[PDB]
């Protein structure tokens, strides 16, 4: 079930807000070229007051679109249904083991015409031959998933389309805007037109291995992994026509195919030895990886019958396009690892890799990454054994590095592409190389060429992330109080950055550079208490908490000005958190002509408008008056699992909180203003019914205006809110039938249970939307309520 649903004006409410917006600006509210007419006048003090309100019956003069009070979110949501079934079976003999499972999932999301499902089989087995010294094994899973996904932007469209627009037009077609009504598409119709854009996805995952133990402590092993998926889909383009929202009469189909084929191969050599007090592992080995991808698709326009049965490429009578390309990479890897344990109380560990990637030139192919960790089982040292209340306590510290090469397969190269221009754009800017050099106006193939996509860089190398870590494990009161702490410092250097080009460089001037650095340090804490009670109740709490800070250390000059990782391209994010943002400081509202004239010069400032702070004190409110106003890093997050067992019943709660987080709300643009949007007459949030006026002087909401004279759309503290939350992620209640009862139906375990996920949300009073975890337009987070069972033989 859809839960946190956004409150959005209704047809009557829409007309009240509009009258306010008009009269605030001092224009005749009867001049809205929609269907509203207003009986209004002035109060004793001279401020405008609304008396009555009449709406016409149709939105057009020719009466093809009736007037509604449509709740568009209720109209695009539904009660979802989930199903889940899984069977698994296992066998274990002296000479081997064997496992087999079958599974199914099916989930009809709360947004209509979106769903997902999965079929799964897995078989694993292993065999011990000779003297259990030759061993063969296999793990393999096979899966078929299929999904129809929510279109891009339906939540914003549902927020945007006014109640007055009906779901169905008089003729029974889909409803749409006409007359003066805004440029917004019918969101029910979008979802329905997209219901057959289903992909089918087959993934096979598994490995096979051989293991040899030629004598005591010596092992050899070789594993070949296979990871292969393929995805097919027809995407259909049906013709639409919702009022003035038209598509001409375009019909098309695109049959798309993709393949991802990855495989892995390694060989491993490990020695073990136990010398009275010394313990020790050594392991050296080698690994190969390779991915090869391909994708292609055929596109055809114009169909006589508009159903997925007809809409195959062979049956189109219009223009065709063909798409596709491949790519891939490979990795080689040489590694060793060394473990040592003295007297089971001092532990040392050593890792060393040399790692090559096809994504670099040979002059930089490999890089070498060592690692070191130490252990100190304090309690086994004899002077700690005067402490009956502390079972084990172990201090550990580690330093080590890891390469990163997760970059474009083409990162090294200067890329020219023919890009004739066969591909959907938006508003032009296809950047194609075809051109009617002849002046014929077309009708036939044009001459074309090549355009630069990327400048190469001969000396890209491995990026290095380096971590230092320290923590301590503990166990008190004979294993009932347990947990661990963690402190780490984590720095990425020579960071591999897709770096934009300087403006004058022009088309495709970007290049991947090792240029940039970024830290993450923080604390991590686990703590669990568990004990029985002397009336029948077992209780087991185990919670956790953590916090971190992130700081960008250096950055290419053109990425600092870019804003790609931070301050909106007005200030450089070097020295701030990844994703921090700069903006104007909103300092309330001008409430009196007095307060505009005494403020800095502010273009568009008047009574009822946002007062922006004069940060440089220059007596002018201009682009220079912005500062660091947004950081996405919580002060801390935390989780907690309560578990109870009483009298064959069991109860679980899992709580999760994030505390101290800034969110940026873009719904607030739609909820607190009549004109903080590109387009006039959109549906608005229900909060602006409380907008400041002479009438209503106790408010934070700017006075309703029809033009963003004050540019209150500018990034500002007005949109940052406290996105802190605590959520009951899950609660589950269970009964398990006593053994003596189920064991006679030959059942080691029979249990039924009942649960609800995401049932409850605690948030800040200063947050003004619904889900602080999903404050804008992403697929809503539903409340699930579940029943289920467990049977085992």
């Amino acid at each position: 079930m859809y839960q946190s649903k956004m409150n959005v004006l209704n047809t009557e409410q829409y007309g009240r807000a509009m009258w306010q917006a008009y009269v605030n600006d001092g224009e005749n509210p009867n001049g809205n070229a929609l269907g509203y007419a207003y009986n209004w006048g002035y109060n004793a003090d001279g401020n405008p007051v609304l008396y009555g309100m009449t709406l016409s019956k149709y939105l057009d003069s020719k009466n093809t679109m009736p007037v509604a009070d449509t709740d568009w979110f209720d109209e695009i949501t539904r009660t979802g249904v989930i199903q889940q079934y899984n069977l698994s079976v296992s066998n274990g003999s002296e000479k081997g083991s064997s496992f087999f499972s079958l599974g199914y999932y099916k989930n009809l999301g709360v947004i209509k015409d979106t769903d997902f499902d999965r079929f799964s089989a897995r078989m694993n087995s292993d065999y011990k031959l000779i003297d259990d010294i030759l061993t063969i094994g296999q793990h393999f899973t096979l899966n078929r998933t299929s999904e129809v996904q929510a279109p891009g932007g339906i939540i914003e469209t549902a927020l945007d389309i006014p109640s007055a627009i009906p779901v169905y037009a008089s003729d029974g077609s889909w409803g749409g805007p006409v007359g003066g009504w805004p440029d917004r598409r019918n969101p029910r119709a979008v979802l329905e037109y997209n219901k057959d854009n289903r992909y089918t996805y087959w993934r096979m995952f598994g490995d096979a291995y051989v293991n040899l133990t030629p004598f005591k402590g010596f092992n050899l092993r070789s594993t070949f992994g296979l990871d292969y998926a393929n995805k097919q889909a027809r995407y259909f383009t049906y013709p639409y026509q919702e009022g003035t929202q038209t598509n001409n009469g375009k019909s098309a189909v695109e049959a798309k195919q993709e393949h991802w084929t990855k495989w892995m191969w390694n060989a491993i050599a490990t020695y073990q030895l136990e010398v009275g007090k010394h313990r020790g592992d050594v392991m050296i080995g080698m690994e190969l990886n390779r991915e090869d991808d391909s994708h292609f698709s055929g596109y055809k326009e114009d169909f006589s019958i508009l159903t997925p049965d007809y809409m195959w490429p062979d049956a189109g009578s219009g223009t065709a396009q063909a798409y596709g390309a491949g790519e891939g990479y490979s990795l080689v890897s040489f590694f060793g690892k060394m473990n040592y344990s003295y007297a089971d109380r001092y532990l040392l560990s050593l890792t060393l890799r040399r790692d090559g990637s096809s994504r670099f030139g040979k002059n930089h192919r490999y890089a070498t990454f060592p690692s070191v960790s130490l252990g100190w089982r304090i309690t086994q040292e004899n002077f700690m054994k005067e402490l009956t209340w502390l079972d084990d306590l172990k201090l550990r510290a580690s330093w080590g590095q890891t390469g990163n090469q997760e970059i474009s397969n083409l990162a090294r190269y200067t890329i020219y592409a023919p890009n004739y221009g066969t591909t959907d754009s938006f508003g032009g800017q296809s950047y194609g190389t075809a051109y009617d050099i002849t002046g014929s106006n077309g009708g036939g193939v044009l001459p074309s060429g090549f355009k630069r996509n990327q400048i190469g860089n001969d000396n890209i190398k491995w990026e290095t992330t380096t971590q230092t870590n320290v923590g301590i494990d503990f166990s008190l009161f004979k294993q009932s109080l347990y947990g661990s702490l963690e402190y780490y410092y984590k720095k990425a250097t020579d960071i591999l950055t897709e770096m934009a080009g300087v403006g004058v460089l022009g088309e495709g001037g970007s290049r991947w550079i090792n240029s940039g650095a970024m830290k993450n340090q923080g604390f991590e804490f686990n703590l669990g208490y568990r004990n029985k009670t002397a009336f029948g109740l077992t209780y087991d709490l185990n919670g956790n908490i953590s916090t971190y800070r992130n700081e960008i250390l250096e950055l290419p000059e053109t990425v600092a000005a870019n804003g790609k990782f931070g301050g909106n391209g007005v200030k450089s994010v070097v020295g701030h958190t990844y994703g921090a943002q700069v903006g104007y400081i909103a300092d309330g509202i001008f409430k009196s002509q007095d307060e505009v004239d005494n403020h800095a010069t502010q273009e568009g400032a008047a009574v009822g408008r946002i007062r922006y702070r004069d940060i440089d004190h220059n007596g002018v409110i201009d682009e220079r008056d912005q500062n660091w106003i947004y950081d996405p890093t919580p002060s801390f997050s935390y989780g907690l699992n309560i578990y109870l067992e009483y009298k064959n019943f069991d109860l679980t709660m899992f709580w999760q909180g994030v505390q101290g987080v800034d969110i940026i709300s873009d719904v607030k643009k739609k909820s607190d203003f009549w004109s903080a949007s590109n387009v006039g007459f959109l549906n608005k949030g229900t909060r602006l019914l409380n907008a400041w006026s002479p009438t209503n002087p106790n408010s934070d909401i700017p006075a309703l205006t029809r033009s963003d004279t004050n540019n209150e759309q500018r990034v500002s503290t007005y949109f940052v809110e406290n996105g802190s939350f605590l959520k009951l992620r899950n609660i589950q209640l269970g009964y398990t039938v006593p053994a003596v009862i189920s064991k006679k139906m030959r059942m080691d375990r029979l249990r039924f249970y009942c649960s609800a996920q995401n049932l409850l949300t605690i948030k800040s009073k200063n947050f003004t939307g619904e889900d602080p975890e999903n404050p804008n337009f992403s697929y809503p987070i539903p409340v699930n309520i579940t029943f289920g069972l467990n049977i085992g033989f």
């Binding site: 020219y416 004739y420 066969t422 032009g428 800017q429 106006n441 460089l505």
Partner: protein
């Protein structure tokens, strides 16, 4: 360990070292043309119309003042921020066109002429394109970066500046590009999208015409008019050079804006938009995708002003009402009018693109603004709704060529420099104005029966050839440029050449408030609003190597 990490290599691309091979040199040339069709979008057309909303010719149109709020800010001269996304956008896009020119030039420079005899005509073509963009950047931003070292490494672009050169020698670095093109282009281009020598002369002249109204001080005011520059506009609009290329005025005005008459004698150089051409929906003029009227559902941008409407009014002898034209609306029944009004402005009660089956009305069906932006439609770039040339992608766009230099421009630009050089050749500038004015008075094919069907009184006459004063002559050329190039997105550009922007537009703001409510709070600040600010992100990345234009605060 080694062969393994080299096997897989880039698929479906050309790499940077390969791109310079001769087999690809002509692919790069074409691609440098292509971006002029494929590189703009609905808010950045290389028409620069989205920015001529500053002019007294038109309003931005659309749903309302927020429908492209940054262009409303531009239209009323208030609340422009140097951080605004459009300003950054157009700067970025134009330098992208420059890239394709330079990349082609980089590989063309290495070609051997004995085995590629068009080496210097191709090179000329590219330098023409490079001049085209630098020219438009210069118009938009004044203080621009000169990017004309096709052999410059990527890293060296970081140490460029928009003040390496003074304002004049910035203009000259553009002139140099178009000059080489004149020296090297062929007189006739059988492939019509390639500029001919006359086009290089035309643009060369236009560059010196803009260069001659000098701003060699620190702000934007005129510091005197240079006549070394003007005598060039004369040299490179010489009728003898234009006749070597076969250019001239179409015998009816409307032909410059009609699909059937592409690449006519007046189209000196045009962007060759095309249809049915292998691309997804066509190489259409997406940049004008916003300016189709509501009859196609969207979007009603680029609507002409009542000011421009009333400008086609004419006195009883067929001359402009210089002083009185804006003091009462154009009334069809009783006013004399210039035929060019009905080729520029589609007006209620009259046919849309010469089609009696689509009559424009003050309606839901034509304008989107409930009257805020008025009820007029821009005719020049739109086309007949029934045309083969018209398709809907994400927007409605046509294959109608965008003409960068109409030969009327060449005649009127020649007229200008002659009038500015008070040197006896003024009766020759009046000779040129009468060329355009008389052609226009007879451009009544396709609207020949408007007297009987609607009542319009066409009345336009040439000026008597007298010994005109320089000041009265300027007024007459200015007026001809008003009616000749309406809605073609160089009206505001003309005003900043003349140093008259504040006076004429701030005045327009008070006269036009009566008809378009948005101009209520409009105010043009001289020595500030004559050019877009250099984009904030651009300056900020420059490490103080870029310098902002005058009038804007230290941000």
């Amino acid at each position: 360990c080694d062969d393994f990490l080299d096997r897989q290599v880039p698929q479906g691309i050309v790499t940077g070292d390969q791109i310079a091979s001769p087999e690809y040199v002509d692919n790069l040339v074409i691609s440098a043309y292509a971006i002029w069709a494929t590189g703009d979008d609905i808010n950045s057309s290389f028409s620069l119309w989205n920015y001529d909303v500053r002019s007294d010719d038109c309003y931005k149109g659309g749903s309302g003042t927020e429908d492209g709020g940054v262009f409303n800010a531009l239209e009323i001269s208030k609340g422009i921020n140097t951080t605004d996304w459009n300003i950054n956008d157009i700067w970025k896009r134009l330098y992208q066109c420059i890239t394709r020119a330079n990349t082609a030039l980089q590989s063309l420079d290495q070609m051997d002429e004995k085995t590629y005899p068009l080496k210097n005509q191709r090179i000329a073509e590219m330098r023409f394109l490079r001049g085209h963009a630098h020219f438009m950047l210069k118009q938009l931003f004044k203080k621009i970066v000169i990017v004309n070292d096709e052999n410059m490494e990527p890293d060296a672009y970081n140490e460029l500046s928009n003040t390496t050169y003074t304002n004049d020698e910035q203009w000259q670095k553009i002139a140099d590009d178009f000059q080489f093109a004149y020296d090297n282009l062929p007189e006739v281009q059988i492939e019509k999208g390639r500029p001919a020598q006359a086009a290089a002369a035309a643009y060369l002249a236009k560059t010196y015409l803009y260069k001659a109204y000098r701003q060699d001080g620190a702000d934007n005011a005129l510091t005197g008019i240079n006549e070394e520059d003007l005598k060039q506009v004369v040299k490179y609009t010489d009728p003898l050079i234009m006749a070597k290329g076969g250019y001239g005025l179409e015998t009816d005005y409307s032909m410059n804006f009609l699909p059937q008459y592409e690449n006519g004698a007046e189209s000196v150089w045009a962007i060759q938009y095309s249809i049915n051409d292998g691309t997804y929906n066509g190489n259409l003029n997406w940049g004008m995708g916003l300016t189709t009227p509501q009859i196609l559902g969207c979007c009603d941008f680029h609507k002409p002003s009542q000011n421009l409407v009333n400008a086609f009014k004419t006195d009883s002898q067929g001359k402009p009402l210089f002083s009185t034209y804006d003091n009462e609306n154009y009334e069809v029944a009783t006013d004399n009018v210039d035929p060019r009004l009905f080729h520029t402005v589609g007006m209620p009660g009259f046919p849309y693109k010469y089609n009696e089956g689509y009559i424009i009305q003050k309606n839901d069906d034509w304008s989107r603004s409930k009257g805020l932006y008025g009820y007029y439609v821009s005719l020049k770039e739109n086309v007949d709704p029934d045309c083969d040339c018209l398709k809907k992608g994400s927007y409605w766009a046509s294959s109608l060529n965008h003409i960068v230099i109409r030969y009327a421009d060449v005649l009127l630009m020649r007229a200008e420099a002659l009038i500015q050089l008070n040197d006896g050749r003024i009766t020759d500038a009046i000779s040129l104005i009468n060329e355009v004015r008389s052609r226009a008075a007879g451009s009544t094919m396709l609207i020949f029966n408007y007297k009987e069907d609607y009542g319009v009184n066409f009345k336009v006459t040439p000026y008597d050839l007298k010994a005109y004063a320089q000041d009265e002559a300027m007024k007459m050329l200015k007026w001809e440029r008003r009616v000749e190039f309406g809605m073609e997105s160089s009206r505001f550009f003309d005003l900043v050449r003349w140093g008259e922007a504040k006076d004429v537009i701030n005045a327009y703001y008070v006269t036009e408030a009566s008809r378009c409510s948005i101009y209520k709070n409009a105010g043009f600040t001289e020595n500030k609003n004559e050019y877009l600010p250099v984009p904030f992100e651009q300056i900020s990345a420059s490490n103080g190597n870029y310098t902002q234009n005058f009038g804007w605060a230290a941000a």
